[PDB]
Design a protein around this ligand. Structure first.
Ligand SMILES: CC(C)C[C@H](NC(=O)[C@@H](O)[C@H](N)Cc1ccccc1)C(=O)O
Ligand code: NA
Ligand code: NA
Ligand code: NA
Ligand code: NA
Ligand code: NA
Ligand SMILES: [Zn+2]
Length: 866
């Protein structure tokens, strides 16, 4: 399989302006007829090269003439000797029922549905399957009326008929030109929740959610969130929906979470269905997120699309930034920012050090599905956020307005988006463009000095980005670096220099620079890189007392949480070294005290309290070390939890009882209290065992909602409490017919600290609720084991590696995209010790030898073995 390179982009030799599709639908054998109006832009001898994969070609006509001047090659139909404008007609056959990879047209339970992003439409018919080719689609669907009473495609329903033999048909027309990745089709039998939203200028939009029969009672939250998304995008970005109908269909078999197909989003049912006894606060808020996100693509991705797939972040980074703003405006911004920072530092940084490292705009791709990444998404968004930080909201919105004004109806690049922001704002972003083209995490080192003679504070800030596997050359970035200076009472000290105020977002543009501040009337405690103002690693020599001070006094809630993380980091590192020498945990008392103080601050927002009392995950802890010892990290996290539980026992139980809530509400104050209560529970679970067991079984049995019940179950598993087995059995007894709810149970099993966890995981491949044919199940058991039980996955005997190789040997042929998600923990081998490396290298070499090795895995494996 061949790499493609961004620098090789060229305008296509042919365009298609309109396509009329006919599906004669059948699970075994669907016949597709595609009539496309085309225009040659290139030279008369440049043939039309159409992409196609696993298609059975039946005929080819040009202006109704059977065409003889063509040939099929690997992945393509190449057609010669064409006129400048012509109608192309292709008839071909495909087989949805055989599509296990879930790309193109496939079967989800009894339904048929599509997934076309990125290059899945070529699995449906021969086409210019590239997103710079935009066309007006009309879609006629013909099918068995009893099996497929609902037949859906993009746009408006314009025609319909009955036929003999129990068949019917419907035709759809989508008036907005689109790249084919935005094509969708769905056929099946559903319950439909119907509502409307009226836009600020008065357009009434029919809203339709299609769910499996019986699930209508789990749909209203998603409907509500769609309405909230549409409203917010009007209030914040001034953007209105542009069609008269908005459809979402929830399907159980889907590789990703959701898809923004124009006017017909297709969603993994995981991010639609909720009821208070099946879904947690977190599920409610994820559903909010994803509904929002796909909706926001309607403009940032659909009305303006991507010129080529290397520009993916233009839509994903920007649309992530939007879904974060949405969540943040509606919920707690601090909690949003916090969790988003956890993800950047604990997962994205890891990827940006891995063999798969890439800039947010990749320069080289073998399999484009491997680039739907933390980097393109999460770091993409941080890059957009830095633009926001440099421009301020008002110029940023001007920038958005120019972007649309210029590019509505077309396919754009990252550089276009940057240029619009620069032209509207008058802020120069030529240096800043470097963030699109350079991989890896910059490291920013800060040194300070206070001069009591001059009342000056001097910061010397330096930056470097270490080389990455993909890039030997690195250069300085334009880093927005926000600071605040605190005096000894915790008040902010005005930043100024030579009589004049100074913006507190510093422009760190060089390898090294000095900034001098005047009238600093006391030696300051600095808050640095406030709000995570740039996606960088900060190197500064805090004292513990600076950090506890910031925990008490910092103006932004983010800086308080962040300071607590810097406090813990030190002692996490200490205790990992200790663990490797067989020593128990050591923690100075004033650390426990900072946490006690948080527990008892009556004025702190319980949302914030709760995040501070949520210890860094093992993945966040991993990023503190050059070489990861996953066992020591895990055991230290446990011991820290044990220590704090013991030291803060009375306080924890007090706060636990005080945040009791009789009523269950999906409301931000209630969620916050409850998130704090269950954080308290989690520590208590690791205290005195009799009390722990009582508390946890009691919460599980008395919970009136899944959030409280799952937090108990999860604590029973984590702390291996006596009630554990009985509670897990009850959950299975009650919930086994429900895959989505079971996924929770599988994750708990897979991430158990128990000694025989691997053995249990293997057994669960045969569980009544598991199947290898559903990505959700695969991800919830196997993926959670490899990615989220690093202590077991990295067992010194290598049994974790072998187990994954077995699973990937199946998935490489069944569903390579899920395979490629799942291989990721293996391609991190260079972060681990030599002996684990040798075993992971051997596993990868075994996979490299598979017959019919997929491209998706080949790309990752060769990079990892290089
Ligand atoms: C909240 C979102 C970040 C959820 C996310 N979905 C998306 O980004 C959709 O906008 C994507 N356009 C769907 C997608 C994902 C992977 C490969 C091809 C297509 C997902 O993981 O499904
Ligand atoms: Na076109
Ligand atoms: Na899009
Ligand atoms: Na808010
Ligand atoms: Na100093
Ligand atoms: Na920190
Ligand atoms: Zn997206």
């Amino acid at each position: 399989p061949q790499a493609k390179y961004r620098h090789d982009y060229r305008a296509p030799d042919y365009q298609i302006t309109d396509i009329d599709l006919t599906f004669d639908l059948d699970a075994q054998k669907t016949v597709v007829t595609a009539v496309s109006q085309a225009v040659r832009h290139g030279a008369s001898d440049a043939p039309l090269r159409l992409n196609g994969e696993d298609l059975k070609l039946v005929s080819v006509h040009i202006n109704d003439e059977p065409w003889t001047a063509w040939k099929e090659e690997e992945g393509a139909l190449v057609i010669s000797n064409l006129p400048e404008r012509f109608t192309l007609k292709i008839i071909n056959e495909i087989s949805p029922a055989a599509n296990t990879a879930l790309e193109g047209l496939y079967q989800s339970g009894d339904a048929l549905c599509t997934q076309c992003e990125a290059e899945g439409f070529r699995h449906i018919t021969y086409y210019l399957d590239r997103p710079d080719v935009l066309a007006r689609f009309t879609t006629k669907i013909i099918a068995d009326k009893i099996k497929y009473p609902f037949l859906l495609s993009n746009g408006n329903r314009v025609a319909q008929g009955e036929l003999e033999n129990g068949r019917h048909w419907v035709q759809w027309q989508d008036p907005f030109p689109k790249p084919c990745y935005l094509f969708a089709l769905v056929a099946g039998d559903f319950d439909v929740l119907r509502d409307t939203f009226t836009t600020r200028s008065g357009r009434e939009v029919a809203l339709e959610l299609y769910v499996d029969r019986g699930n209508l009672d789990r749909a209203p939250w998603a409907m509500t969130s769609l309405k909230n998304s549409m409203k917010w995008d009007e209030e914040r970005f001034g953007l209105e929906y542009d069609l008269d109908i908005y459809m979402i269909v929830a399907v159980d078999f889907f590789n990703a979470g959701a898809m923004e197909n124009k006017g017909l989003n297709i969603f993994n049912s995981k991010y639609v269905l909720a009821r208070t006894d099946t879904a947690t606060d977190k599920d409610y808020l994820d559903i909010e997120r994803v509904i929002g996100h796909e909706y926001f693509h309607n403009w940032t991705g659909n009305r303006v699309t991507c010129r080529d797939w290397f520009q993916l972040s233009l839509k994903e980074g920007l649309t992530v930034f939007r879904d974060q703003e949405f969540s943040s405006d509606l919920g707690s911004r601090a909690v949003n920012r916090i969790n988003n920072v956890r993800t950047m530092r604990g997962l994205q940084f890891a990827e940006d050090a891995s063999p798969m490292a890439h800039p947010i705009r990749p320069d080289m791709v073998i399999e484009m599905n491997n680039f739907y990444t933390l980097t393109v998404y999460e770091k993409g968004a941080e890059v957009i956020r830095m633009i926001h930080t440099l421009l301020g909201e008002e110029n940023f919105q001007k920038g958005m307005q120019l972007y649309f004004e210029r590019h509505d109806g077309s396919a754009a690049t990252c550089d276009d988006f940057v240029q619009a922001m620069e032209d509207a704002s008058n802020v120069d972003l030529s240096h800043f463009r470097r963030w699109y083209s350079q991989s890896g995490t910059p490291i920013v080192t800060v040194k300070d000095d206070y001069n009591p003679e001059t009342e000056q504070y001097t910061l010397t800030i330096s930056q470097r980005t270490p080389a990455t596997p993909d890039q030997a050359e690195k250069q300085p970035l334009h880093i927005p670096f926000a600071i605040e200076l605190y005096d000894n009472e915790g008040k902010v000290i005005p930043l100024q220099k030579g009589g004049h105020p100074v913006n507190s977002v510093l422009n760190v543009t060089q390898a090294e620079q000095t900034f001098v501040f005047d009238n600093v009337y006391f030696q300051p405690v600095p808050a640095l890189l406030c709000e995570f103002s740039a996606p960088v690693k900060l190197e500064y020599k805090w004292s513990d007392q600076q950090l506890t001070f910031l925990m008490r006094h910092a103006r932004n809630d983010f800086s308080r949480w962040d300071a607590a993380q810097s406090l813990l980091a030190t002692y996490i590192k200490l205790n990992v070294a200790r663990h490797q020498q067989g020593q128990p945990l050591s923690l100075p008392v004033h650390v426990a005290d900072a946490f006690r103080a948080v527990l008892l601050d009556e004025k702190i927002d319980p949302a914030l309290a709760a995040e501070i009392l949520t210890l860094p995950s093992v993945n966040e802890m991993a990023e503190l070390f050059d070489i990861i010892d996953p066992i020591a990290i895990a055991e230290v996290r446990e011991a820290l939890t044990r220590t704090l539980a013991t030291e803060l026992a009375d306080e924890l139980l007090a706060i636990y009882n005080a945040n009791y809530q009789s009523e269950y509400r999906v409301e931000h104050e209630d969620i916050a209290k409850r998130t704090l209560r269950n954080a308290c529970l989690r520590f208590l679970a690791f205290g005195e065992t009799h009390l722990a067991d009582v508390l946890v079984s009691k919460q599980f049995h008395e919970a009136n909602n899944m959030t409280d019940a799952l937090a108990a179950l999860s604590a029973a598993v984590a702390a291996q409490l006596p009630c554990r087995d009985a509670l897990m059995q009850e959950y299975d007894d009650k919930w086994h017919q429900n895959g989505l709810v079971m996924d929770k149970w599988f994750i708990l099993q897979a991430t158990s600290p128990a000694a025989n966890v691997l053995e249990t995981v293997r057994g669960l491949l045969q569980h009544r609720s598991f199947t290898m044919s559903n990505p959700n199940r695969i991800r919830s058991l196997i993926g959670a084991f490899a990615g989220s039980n690093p202590a077991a996955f990295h067992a010194e005997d290598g049994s974790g590696y072998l187990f994954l190789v077995e699973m990937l040997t199946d998935l490489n042929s069944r569903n390579p995209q899920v395979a490629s998600r799942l291989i990721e923990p293996l391609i991190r081998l260079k972060r681990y010790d030599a002996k684990r490396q040798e075993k992971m290298r051997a596993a990868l070499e075994q996979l490299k030898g598979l017959e019919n090795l997929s491209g998706d895995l080949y790309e990752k494996i060769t990079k990892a073995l290089a």
